[PDB]
Amino acid sequence: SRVCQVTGKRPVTGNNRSHALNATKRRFLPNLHSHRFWVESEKRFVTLRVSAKGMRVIDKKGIDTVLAELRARGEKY
Amino acid sequence: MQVILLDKVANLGSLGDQVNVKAGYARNFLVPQGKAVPATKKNIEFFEARRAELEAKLAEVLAAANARAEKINALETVTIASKAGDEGKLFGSIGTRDIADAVTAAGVEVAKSEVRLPNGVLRTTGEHEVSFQVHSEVFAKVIVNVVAE
RNA sequence: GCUUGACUGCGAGCGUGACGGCGCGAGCAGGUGCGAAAGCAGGUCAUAGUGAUCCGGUGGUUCUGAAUGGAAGGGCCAUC
RNA sequence: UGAGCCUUGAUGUGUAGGAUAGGUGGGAGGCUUUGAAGUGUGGACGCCAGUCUGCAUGGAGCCGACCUUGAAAUACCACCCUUUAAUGUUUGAUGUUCUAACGUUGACCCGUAAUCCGGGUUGCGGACAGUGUCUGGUGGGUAGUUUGACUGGGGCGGUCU
RNA sequence: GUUUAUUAAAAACACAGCACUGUGCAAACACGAAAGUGGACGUAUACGGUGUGACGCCUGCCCGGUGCCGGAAGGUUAAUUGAUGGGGUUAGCGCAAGCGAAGCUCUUGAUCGAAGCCCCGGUAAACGGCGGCCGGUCCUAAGGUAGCGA
RNA sequence: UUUUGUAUAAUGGGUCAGCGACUUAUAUUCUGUAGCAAGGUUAACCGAAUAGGGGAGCCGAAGGGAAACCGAGUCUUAACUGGGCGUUAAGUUGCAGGGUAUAGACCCGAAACCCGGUGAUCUAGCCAUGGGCAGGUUGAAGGUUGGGUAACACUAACUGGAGGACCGAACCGACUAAUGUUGAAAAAUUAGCGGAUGACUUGUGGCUGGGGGUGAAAGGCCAAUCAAACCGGGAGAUAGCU
RNA sequence: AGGGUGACAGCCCCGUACACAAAAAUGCACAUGCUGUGAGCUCGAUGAGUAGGGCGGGACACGUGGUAUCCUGUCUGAAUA
RNA sequence: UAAGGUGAUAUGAACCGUUAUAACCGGCGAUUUCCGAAUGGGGAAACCCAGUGUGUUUCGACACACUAUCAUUAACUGAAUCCAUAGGUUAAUGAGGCGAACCGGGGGAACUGAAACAUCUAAGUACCCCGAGGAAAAGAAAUCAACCGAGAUUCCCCCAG
């Protein structure tokens, strides 16, 4: 499913509102990308399905902390 | 993205400098190789102690060919050789990269890689370059004094 | 010929409308025009020439102003 | 191929003149052997007078109070105003190259006696493609609806204050 | 051959043939939030769509309009960006009507900005259209040709 | 019953028996009645619980004005001799009733919309694997004996056995007529009729699901139902109509 | 109280008021154990891709209006007593 | 506890008991075919077909036990690939399913009303889905108030149509 493994962002339902204020249901999808992160603690490439915001979170925190959170949450990566 | 350079980079800095590098460059090239590492405060507070080992030992043993992408083309190396080949068009032959070399035996020692394996190509109508290669057809086809010298 | 009564606040009392409303009106206060004066003038001989409410725009008005002082916004008056 | 900008190299013709006076302090000498002054000359600029520049050789001298001048020296030093050259430098753009993101419904190895999937090696593409948000156009493909009343039936015609 | 099982079997549908058109393969297209699947374990002598409907003679003219296709000097044009202006607040100055720095803030909207539309050309076996006037001439995109006709 | 008007040949009822339609809740206004009275009354809650406590509140005794504000006055206006709205009328809390409001709101009754499931044992298409097609005709290609060219053309006999070929049973269908139409049958019977080796037919199993399928295309078929199936739900939809 | 009994029962029966009862299991309270979780004072520290912002929606009685506050799909992004 | 019983239709037969193992009642135990989350594999539910390990045997065959998936921990084991990692086997623990309402969350109509209808209503209702408990959720102020103060969440009555 379209879920960011770092942040948990899912598709979220909302409205397309016309100029006549016609409300038709729609989905906002996240900006998911499958990325191979070079983990140094294991000398490996770990593939994760991550949003761009999650990638910024990885850049800030460090991949080690993010993976620690993921494995504390479960999330077989 | 602010990063501290563990080694020399072409147009960013040399041997320790908080450089504002684009996130894609840092994420995909500098950190996957041994060139830089992001400065999250604690990292520089460890770098200020690591510099004793880094700036001398690692600097002496390896300070060029950080990713063998541009330093191989700029700093010409492994020019001297003995193996010629077939007629002047290297194709699938690793040749010699370590033996019969003098400059690449002291401190900093750049390196090279292999070429395209034989599946469609052969000893005519093209050539290869003795250096690191990702492309094998559109890559530069400059003579390296190994294809026929 | 001279002029701006095509004035401002009100208005006894009437007429005509289911209503929303429409109409006539002497007279009072202010200020004014014409006439020596008595007086006349709140548009045009009269009856057609028109569009409720909501939303909003402009001028004025310290009426209100969500802790307090402002201000925004709202009200009231004139008007699109 | 454009612009801001630490900073510095160039810009300052009422005219008095030895001729190209933004200005206040500080001061009476700046530069010249990591080379002065004299010549050809490089493309810049110019008010038709030179300023400032690269280089060749060059090898002991150009530049004040000068007398005047509303202003006294680019003599040194500093902030700074008109203008104008360049780059480390920040993003704008065109192009070409590159590889490390990303694609591969190419090849070979392994999980594995498996046309899936994954990992790996290699090639080919390559910051393109493609996906998320936002955005202009198109869009009976689909959907929800509206399409008045009077009226010698209704419609067509007429009408509606 | 097929067709309204149960009032219509036909001149209707289909059809071999033909033409146009799209599609270079991860094909177009279709079913699918997707993965994937058909097309096709096929590869332009193939595949889809659309029209006509054996075969014979043929299939005339028009690109003005709508559509599609191609190309472009220029015009207008979104998101994004935010030059300049205007207003609120208050430091202060004000024997005071009042003025009013900085910061935050409301408002305006200079500049950049693609396709599209405007414009030019092609295309009718695309949707479609195919004259009058007097015994040369106006108009048009062109003015119904061959054949057939109560 | 409905109408201007019904013996009406306008609707309804075969008859009897049983059931069958103005309700309930909370607000609000008016009338009657009872208590108290410039006062009336509690809600939740506590409570050995229809008591008693609880006055939090609500209405009333003051109105005017958009409002600040003023106040038996106030607003309008610079101001009213004026004018408007008030001051000179007891209210409140239960109980009963009449209206109204929200709720299904007097009862029954749509066509239809939406949601979630059940259906390809019928049928339409497709897929896999088995089967069926009496008998009789005609006589393509091709091939051998001939007639023929310098060698291709070619013309007869024999052989051969093609075809979405022909006649016609099984089988598949359904053009005409009669019958039947509270049928023997919710589509048939009799007599005739089309195809009948093919684009045929048929058995067994599988796949395609409702804004969807399938369709040699008739809006055809998808379990006797189809211009949007059936079941259950929103649901007592709504019904200015009967 | 109620229910039966050949009709309607305080005194026929079963019951009711009331007083009693558990070998065994178990709940509730106290008292009361085993293991294990760790009070108090003093120093500090005191939650960053977060608050906030552009764009698109939604929830707040509030439909974007002059519209505060709250959540976030996308792009960004501080101070830190 | 008991002088009567072996459930009813429901008679009969054969019996059991009558001072306490007849019966009946309550607590704790044992037995508990097959299907069914069904769990050794399969399947058109209540059926079909097995493997391994013990123990019997007349040598015919028998009886018992185990044998699913996934999640977590460990232990051994271990590719491409040197160390490694994915992966494989084994062992322990846990889960799976059913159930009326209440509860939190993810999605989410239309009829209808507006006397048409699109913003709006209906309504975050109906319905689908995930998850927990006996309750759930929320909960101890980056909350209100107003210059006076209050002091976590939850529920009822007013405020107030």
Side-chain angles (χ1 to χ4, degrees), chain B residues 76-128:
Chain B
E76 292 180 351
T77 48
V78 185
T79 299
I80 58 174
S82 296
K83 177 56 171 164
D86 297 343
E87 62 184 349
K89 298 175 175 292
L90 192 144
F91 271 103
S93 300
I94 56 169
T96 61
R97 63 187 67 177
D98 295 339
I99 208 76
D101 289 336
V103 300
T104 317
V108 62
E109 295 173 6
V110 304
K112 299 179 163 184
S113 187
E114 71 196 340
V115 290
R116 173 166 183 169
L117 298 169
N119 46 26
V121 307
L122 213 56
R123 60 170 166 73
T124 312
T125 317
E127 58 182 330
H128 283 150

Side-chain angles (χ1 to χ4, degrees), chain A residues 6-52:
Chain A
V6 175
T7 62
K9 289 164 173 294
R10 329 189 66 100
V12 295
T13 65
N15 292 333
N16 259 318
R17 290 288 191 149
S18 87
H19 280 286
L21 272 53
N22 296 125
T24 187
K25 300 299 293 295
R26 59 159 286 186
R27 305 179 93 206
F28 301 80
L29 309 179
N31 199 5
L32 283 79
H33 296 295
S34 179
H35 208 84
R36 299 153 49 251
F37 296 104
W38 168 257
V39 68
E40 184 65 26
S41 174
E42 199 159 24
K43 299 265 171 191
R44 192 161 57 102
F45 270 103
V46 173
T47 191
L48 270 183
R49 192 177 179 176
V50 71
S51 73

Side-chain angles (χ1 to χ4, degrees), chain B residues 34-52:
Chain B
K35 309 202 206 77
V37 68
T40 183
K41 292 312 248 193
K42 56 196 295 291
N43 287 359
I44 59 172
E45 281 148 34
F46 304 150
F47 193 89
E48 62 87 20
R50 284 195 284 263
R51 64 178 63 174

